[PDB]
Each structure stands twice: as C-alpha cells, then as structure tokens.
Amino acid sequence: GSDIPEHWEEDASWGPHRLAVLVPFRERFEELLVFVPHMRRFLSRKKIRHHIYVLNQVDHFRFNRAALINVGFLESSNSTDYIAMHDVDLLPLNEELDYGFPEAGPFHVASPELHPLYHYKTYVGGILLLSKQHYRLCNGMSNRFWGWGREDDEFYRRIKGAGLQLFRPSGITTGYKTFRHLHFKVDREGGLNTVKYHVASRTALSVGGAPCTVLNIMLDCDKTATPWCTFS
Ligand SMILES: O=c1ccn([C@@H]2O[C@H](COP(=O)(O)OP(=O)(O)O)[C@@H](O)[C@H]2O)c(=O)[nH]1
Ligand SMILES: [Mn+2]
Incomplete structure (x- = not known):
C-alpha cells in the first residue's frame, strides 16, 4: 500500500536546510524499492527535509557514478542546499547518524568503523554529505574514471586540496x-x-507512497579523451 503518514509532513520545526539525496543507479530495482521508503521514514523522523534523486544512467557507456553525482547536483532542485551522495543499498539503522546540514565540512556518514565491509582511514564512499557550496568548492567529482580506479579517493584529495576537512x-x-x-x-x-x-x-x-524523482541521464563521453568510456 501507499498511504502517506503524518510524520512525513514538514513544518516550521524541521528547520531551514533541505537535503538532496543523490542515488546513482543501474539495475538495482529490488534495493530501490526498500531504499526510497526506508530513507523517507528515517529522514522524516529526524525532521530532515529532503528530495530523493535516482540518477539512472541510460547511455550505453560504462557506469560512471561520479559523473552521475555531478549531474544530480546540477539537476537537483535549487531548494536543496546540501547533498548526500548515497549508495542505494546501504541503509542507515541508527537514528544518531547525523544527516543534518554539514556546515563545518563534508560529513562521511558510512565511516570505516561503521561500514559492514570497508575499513581504511581515507575510505570516503557509501554515504557522504556536503553543503552545495563545499561540493562546488571541490569542483564536484572527477568524470574521467568511468568505473575504473578509485574515484572516491580522488574525491578525498579534492576535499583536502580545497582546504576542507572531513x-x-x-x-x-x-x-x-x-x-x-x-x-x-x-x-x-x-x-x-x-x-x-x-x-x-x-x-x-x-514507492509505497514515498516519492522520488528518477532522472534518466545520458552522459556524453569524449572518446578521444576517455576512449575507455566505451569499454563495456
Ligand atoms: O552497477 C551498479 C553499480 C553501483 N551502483 C550504485 O553505486 C553504489 C556503489 O556501488 P557498489 O555497491 O556496487 O560498490 P561498493 O560501493 O560497494 O564498493 C551502489 O550502492 C549503487 O547506488 C548501481 O546502482 N549499479
Ligand atoms: Mn554496496
């Protein structure tokens, strides 16, 4: 079913920021069906204003998460003032995880001490929140990886290079x-x-009443610069 419960309604007590949840996506239908209402629930109990954007890569190039996150930033509503780069299959269970506006610097929710798998000091993946100003300060993420290498650690380098701390x-x-x-x-x-x-x-x-916006994105690839975008 699809009723909308009361606690999903916003009021003046939720405060002034609004979170764009940017979910890079390819063939994760099953996880999405759990994810969209899970997050609507989790965030709405925490009084976090949000909109969820499923970044659906429908070109036939290799899957480029970072490039997708850049598009999500660019296409998200101007009423959102921070973003959460957020894997579709990682659900927060702990109400104390801070998904609030990360004014001091990027906030890595899925820390290596908390992740079910990954465990190294500069692991930056899974769930990472930045103010839109900070994301712009970093020039967003590299588009060039096309699924190869570690686009997240390169992002960590952008963060430190920009003067920010994590x-x-x-x-x-x-x-x-x-x-x-x-x-x-x-x-x-x-x-x-x-x-x-x-x-x-x-x-x-x-999804059972919980809304999200699916963006079908066609990324362009300059095959002369990154021919490997085709290597799929
Ligand atoms: O084929 C893919 C690759 C990944 N993703 C998204 O990118 C995230 C991270 O990719 P994945 O979980 O496969 O790798 P991991 O982050 O666990 O190393 C996922 O949670 C999804 O949101 C996706 O939807 N389809
Ligand atoms: Mn995963």
Missing part, C-alpha cells in the same frame, strides 16, 4: 550493524564544470 560520526555504538547492506591515473582537470550530459526524461516515482 568529519565522521562520533559516539556511535552499533558497529558493523550501524547500516543494513542489501545484496587509475587520469588527468586531474575537470569535474562539475566539465560534465557533459542531457536528461532524456524525468519521472515522478512513489
């Missing part, structure tokens, strides 16, 4: 049960200001 949950006592987990040297130049794309369609989707 913060992580403190005082969290659940462990590898904090989340439910459902189951390359390129040029440094470019990112948010060089991503090329178009949106083939936008679709309003409700």
